[PDB]
Amino acid sequence: MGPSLDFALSLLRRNVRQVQTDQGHFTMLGVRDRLAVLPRHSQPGKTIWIEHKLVNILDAVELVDEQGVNLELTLITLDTNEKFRDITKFIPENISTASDATLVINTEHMPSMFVPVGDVVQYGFLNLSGKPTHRTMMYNFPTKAGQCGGVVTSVGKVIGIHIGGNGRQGFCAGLKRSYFA
Ligand SMILES: */C(=C/C(=O)OCC)[C@H](C[C@@H]1CCNC1=O)NC(=O)[C@H](Cc1ccccc1)NC(=O)CC(C)C
């Protein structure tokens, strides 16, 4: 097996989970220790369903920038014995572009799904169903409902979390390492 396929499969196995909030089905990225990230609009409560069991959420942090604008990410600390394989070193220090990215989705409805979204470019501002949102990137792929939380990936790097689309193109919140420090 090749190194690209090995990386995404290993991510799927060790770090990318099927979850459900009151808002419905999402892919969750497990970053390190008890720390995971979801799209903000998933609105995780005091518990979240994670693959086959209800998990207590110990804390939730909605990320905003300096201007107070939505970044569309929520950091959650889970009450579990597992520590996620630590993938922070695959997350760039700054929000970074990629060629030929792959979007890795893992939901009950869309399990272990690989979507070849193409190149990922800087986008910046996005209007997200009324909510202004900063620090996003774009791929010209017609992403759909159900794929939020999907992990944008390329050459052993974890660069974004899928957050929306307009029927023609798709948008991720960009990842930087310092959100997980
Ligand atoms: C991901 C969440 C989802 O499935 O829930 C809606 C039922 C979704 C992916 C989108 C849908 C169409 N194509 C996609 O890639 N994201 C959203 O639906 C965004 C929902 C949202 C609403 C209010 C606040 C935050 C997020 N909205 C969009 O993708 C629409 C445009 C970016 C404006």
Ranges of each domain in the chain: 1-15+85-181, 16-84
**How many angstroms separate the alpha carbon of residue 3 from the centre of ligand 1?**
32
**How many angstroms separate the alpha carbon of residue 164 from the centre of ligand 1?**
4
Separation between Cα atoms, residue 149 and residue 106, nearest integer Å: 9
Please say whether the beta carbons of 13 and 6 come within 8 A.
no
Separation between Cα atoms, residue 181 and residue 169, nearest integer Å: 31
Query: What experimental approach yielded this model?
Result: X-ray
Separation between Cα atoms, residue 90 and residue 83, nearest integer Å: 17
What resolution in angstroms does the PDB record give? 2.1
Q: Find out if CATH 3.20.20.70 is the number for domain 1-15+85-181.
A: no
Separation between Cα atoms, residue 104 and residue 4, nearest integer Å: 12
**How many angstroms separate the alpha carbon of residue 165 from the centre of ligand 1?**
6
CB neighbour class for 31 (10 Å; exposed up to 12, middle 13-18, buried from 19) = buried
Please say whether the beta carbons of 56 and 46 come within 8 A.
yes
Q: Is the CB of 25 under 6 A from ligand 1?
A: no
Separation between Cα atoms, residue 139 and residue 115, nearest integer Å: 11
16-84 belongs to which homologous superfamily? Answer: Trypsin-like serine proteases (2.40.10.10)
Q: Is the CB of 89 under 6 A from ligand 1?
A: no
